[PDB]
């Protein structure tokens, strides 16, 4: 049977137009009061995932 | 495309032959060899007869060296299978209108 798109990924990540994996930045969900403004500020942005891990997270998205 | 490459090959060889009609065939094999004889079809070469005329296809279909086909079913394999290739201008015509 055809492959099933892994939703755990399509809800977290997004494949660009060139073949890269871009997921939001980890750290600023909670426990943020004493964090920097630089640390809260920078973590509110996407980051290109490491090539090996992204390659895996695209085989889970066979139809996007 | 392979249905036009197939023919053309036999065309390069000159093994391709067309005919207006089949003079005097009416459903008897022997009515055909007399024809095929006069068309240079001696039997020394396997042939692909390609026409719509049923009687004709019925006359030679039992012949150990003739492949019959309604031109609506002309296919490469049968072409390559053979050493020559014959058609009605009709069968020739629809042919044109399929590779076009």
């Amino acid at each position: 049977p055809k492959m099933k798109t892994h939703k755990g990924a399509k809800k977290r990540v997004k494949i660009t137009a060139s073949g890269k994996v871009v997921a939001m930045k980890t750290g600023k969900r909670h426990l943020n009061w004493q964090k920097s403004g630089k640390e809260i500020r920078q973590k509110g942005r996407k980051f290109v995932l490491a090539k090996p891990e992204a390659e895996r997270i695209k085989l889970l998205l066979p139809y996007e | 495309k392979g249905l036009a490459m197939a023919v053309a090959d036999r065309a390069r060889e000159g093994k391709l032959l067309l005919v207006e009609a089949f003079a005097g065939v009416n459903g008897k094999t022997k009515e055909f060899l007399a024809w095929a004889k006069e068309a240079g079809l001696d039997g020394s070469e396997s042939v692909l007869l390609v026409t719509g005329n049923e009687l004709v296809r019925r006359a030679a279909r039992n012949l150990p060296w003739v492949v019959t086909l309604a031109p609506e079913g002309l296919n490469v394999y049968d072409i390559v299978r053979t050493e020559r290739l014959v058609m009605d201008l009709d069968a020739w015509e629809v042919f044109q209108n399929r590779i076009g």
């Binding site: 892994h6 755990g8 977290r12 990540v13 997921a23 980890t26 995932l49 889970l60 | 390559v80």
Partner: protein, 149 residues
């Protein structure tokens, strides 16, 4: 031409890799599969695309973004596909969503929106939305834009 003459071009019908048939093949015994281990075993490893050996996975550890949807589900609002001017050079005269579909440019169900990456042509164009850039090019190139409802 002749059946015996019909080869495939070299390399277009490669052989196969038979494992487990002797020392010579270099694939015998362990069948190119290693020694012991869950990977040599039949069935094998959990989805290597995700699983990592127990630790929290790289993907499960990434945060989720945006709206994930809710039931009954998707909301229906008109959808727009944009086509660039240069892709419109091939036509003459009057362009509409239809022709751009049967040409292979605009998908069905979506609406037509013109973009500007190209150069306009003094053409009657009919669409559901243009871009600021696309218009200026389209009105400047002696064209006749025509919005829809």
């Amino acid at each position: 031409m002749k059946l015996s003459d019909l080869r495939p071009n070299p390399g277009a019908n490669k052989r196969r890799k038979r494992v487990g048939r002797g020392p010579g093949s270099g694939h015998g015994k362990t069948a190119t599969r290693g020694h012991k281990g869950q990977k040599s075993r039949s069935g094998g490893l959990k989805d290597p695309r995700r699983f990592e050996g127990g630790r929290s996975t790289t993907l499960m550890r990434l945060p989720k973004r945006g709206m994930q949807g809710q039931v009954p589900g998707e909301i229906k609002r008109p959808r727009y596909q944009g086509v660039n001017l240069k892709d419109l050079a091939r036509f003459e005269g009057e362009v509409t969503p239809e022709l751009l579909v049967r040409a292979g440019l605009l998908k069905k169900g979506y609406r037509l929106k013109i973009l500007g990456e190209g150069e306009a042509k003094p053409l009657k164009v009919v669409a559901h939305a243009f871009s600021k850039s696309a218009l200026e090019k389209l009105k400047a190139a002696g064209g006749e834009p025509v919005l829809l409802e």
